Amino acid sequence: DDMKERDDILLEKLNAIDKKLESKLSELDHTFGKKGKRLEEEIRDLAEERNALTEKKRQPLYRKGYDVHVIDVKKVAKVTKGGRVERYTALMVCGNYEGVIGYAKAKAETGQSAMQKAYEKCFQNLHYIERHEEHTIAHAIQTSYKKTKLYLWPAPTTTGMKAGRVVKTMLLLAGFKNIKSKVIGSRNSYNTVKAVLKALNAVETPKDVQEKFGRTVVEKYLL
C-alpha cells in the first residue's frame, strides 16, 4: 500500500510549496529594490524545487497480464537545406484477451525509442468490446474508414479465425476466437486498425436491442 503514501507525501510537499510561494508573491508588489531582488531569487529557487517535485508524479504504469504487439514501424523523412532529416514512427496495440483493447502511435528519432514511447502511451486509450459467448461477434458487420472497407462475419464454435495480419492480431488480443474477415480497398495498416475499432464498436448486442426496443430478445435454441 506504499504507492498511496508515496503520492501523499508529494501532495503535502506541493501544498506547502504553494503556500510559501503565495506568501512571497503577496509581498513582491509592495517590495521594491534589493529586497525585491532577493525575493525574486527565492521565488525562482522555490519554482525550481516545485518543478522538480511535479516532474516526479509522472510515473507511467503498465498493467500486468496485458499483451503488447507492434503493428508498424516506418522511416519518414523531412527535407531541410542541410540534407534529409529522418525520424521513426511506431504503431502498437495492446489487449488483455478479455475484451479490452487499445492502440497508440508515436514518433521518435530511433526505432527503439519510437516503440518505447508508443509502449508508454498504449495504455491511455482503452476500449471495451462485447463478445457473444466469449468466442465470436453477435452478428456480421461491415464498415469503412476512408478507403478501407472491412467485413466481419461470425462463425460456429469449431471454425477458427480467418484474417490477415493486422486484423488477426487485433481480434486475437481483443479475445475473439471464431471470426471470418475480409479487407477490401486500400490496405493501409493505420486505417485498418481504425476500421477494426470502428467495426468492433458498431456491433449491436442482444442486450442493446433489448434496451432500445423494450422487448425480450431470446436465443433461438432456447425456444
Binding site: 501532495l11 506541493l14 504553494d18 508573491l25 521565488i43 519554482a47 518543478n51 511535479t54 509522472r58
Partner: protein, 204 residues
C-alpha cells in the same frame, strides 16, 4: 400553487429572454419568438437547475473537487465568494483569476513554469484533478469545455440560444438561460446552500 411563484421568481430574474435565431439543438428548450428574441422555457430552466444543483450537492458526500471558471468581469465577486465557500482553504485567487487563460492547463497540468517579471502573476496547475467544472463563459474565451471533454470530466454550464453544436454536445449539465446578474447570483446561491447543507450532514 407555489410552483407558479417559483417560476415567476425565475421570470423576475430576467433569465427567460434569449437572443434571436436559436440553433436546432435549443428549440427543445425554447418556447416561442417575440420582439426579436427567443423565449426560453422557465419550466425546463427550473428542471435543469434542480438537476445541476443536485449533482453539485451530491459530490460533497463523495468528497469531490469542484473547479470554477469565470471569464466575465461582471460576475467576479459572486464566483469569488462561491469558490471561497466551497473550495475552502484550498483556494488560490491568482489561479482562479489567471489559469483559465493558459491553453492546455488541464491536459498539460504538469508542465514547468518559469518566473519572469511582474507579468500577469505566476500560477501553477492544480495538484489534484478536478471532478467537475462549472463554467461561466458565454463568449467562449477559453478551451475549458474542450479540455474537459478530452479528459472526461463533467461540465456544468449555462447555455445561450446561439451555442455551437460542437461546444453543446460536450456539456453534461446544460442550464438554458440568459446569464443576467440576478440569475448568476441565484444559481451560485442555490449551489452554495446545497453544498453547505450537505457538508453539515457529516458534522463539518
Amino acid at each position: 400553487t407555489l410552483h407558479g411563484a417559483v417560476i415567476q421568481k425565475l421570470l423576475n430574474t430576467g433569465s427567460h429572454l434569449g437572443r434571436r435565431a436559436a440553433e436546432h439543438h435549443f428549440k427543445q428548450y425554447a418556447y416561442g419568438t417575440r420582439n426579436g428574441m427567443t423565449i426560453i422555457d422557465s419550466d425546463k430552466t427550473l428542471i435543469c437547475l434542480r438537476s445541476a444543483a443536485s449533482f453539485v450537492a451530491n459530490l460533497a458526500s463523495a468528497r469531490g473537487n469542484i473547479f470554477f471558471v469565470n471569464t466575465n468581469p461582471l460576475f467576479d465577486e459572486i464566483v469569488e465568494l462561491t469558490s471561497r465557500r466551497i473550495q475552502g482553504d484550498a483556494y488560490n485567487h491568482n489561479r482562479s483569476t489567471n489559469l483559465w487563460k493558459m491553453g492546455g492547463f488541464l491536459t498539460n497540468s504538469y508542465s514547468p513554469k518559469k518566473f519572469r517579471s511582474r507579468h500577469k502573476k505566476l500560477c501553477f496547475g492544480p495538484t489534484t484533478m478536478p471532478d467537475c467544472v462549472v463554467v461561466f463563459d458565454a463568449e467562449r474565451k477559453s478551451s475549458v469545455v474542450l479540455e474537459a471533454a478530452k479528459l472526461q470530466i463533467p461540465v456544468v454550464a449555462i447555455v445561450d440560444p446561439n451555442v455551437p453544436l460542437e461546444f453543446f454536445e460536450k456539456i453534461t449539465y446544460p442550464v438554458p438561460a440568459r446569464d443576467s446578474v440576478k440569475f448568476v447570483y441565484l444559481f451560485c446561491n442555490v449551489i452554495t446552500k446545497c453544498f453547505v447543507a450537505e457538508q453539515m450532514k457529516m458534522g463539518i
